Design a binder for this molecule. Sequence first.
Ligand code: HEM
Length: 183
Amino acid sequence: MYGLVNKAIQDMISKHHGEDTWEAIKQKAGLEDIDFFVGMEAYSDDVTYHLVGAASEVLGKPAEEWWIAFGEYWVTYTSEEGYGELLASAGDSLPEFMENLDNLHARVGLSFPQLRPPAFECQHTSSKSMELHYQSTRCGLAPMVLGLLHGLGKRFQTKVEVTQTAFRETGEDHDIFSIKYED
Ligand code: HEM
């Protein structure tokens, strides 16, 4: 993934747990040599998965829970490190934001030429609920998606109830979530 994802993970860990801990994770992740992540440069996806795995091993929480925290953090991080206006442009409610998300990543992808973005399709079941289809070229990021949804709930001051109803990792086609939301 592009370096800014890896910077966000370093930032979250460093902010929440201090620099010393970060270094132990980075070493455990096999990344001691990498002096710093370059935000606009592409890295092997392995780098990200290893950081998350090393974070779990060092701080002893399941990786799924790290991905959730990271997903939530990403909503603030992007808003604060150069993508505040882009986020604002994608709307001011959860269902509108989710409808715009593919176009938001198309916009990111004009700037990050090698981007492999997720794909999100909404099927609205009422004015306050939807089924969300999440398609990805990657494995294991559903929990990041749960955390991102919670991040968006906070951004829009909206209560978001999310339950995963289909799983990419089993045979099923792709991850699906049922979501209810209200203000
Ligand atoms: C705020 C709501 C957002 C959500 C819910 C979201 C969702 C996701 C998800 C689930 C992924 C994981 C990749 C995959 O599924 O294959 C991802 C990747 C990524 N997103 Fe977004 N995203 C959001 C906002 C943004 C913003 C504002 C940016 C601006 C930079 C951004 C840039 C990226 C980048 C660089 C990647 C890594 C993909 C790669 O390197 O190929 N995202 N996003």
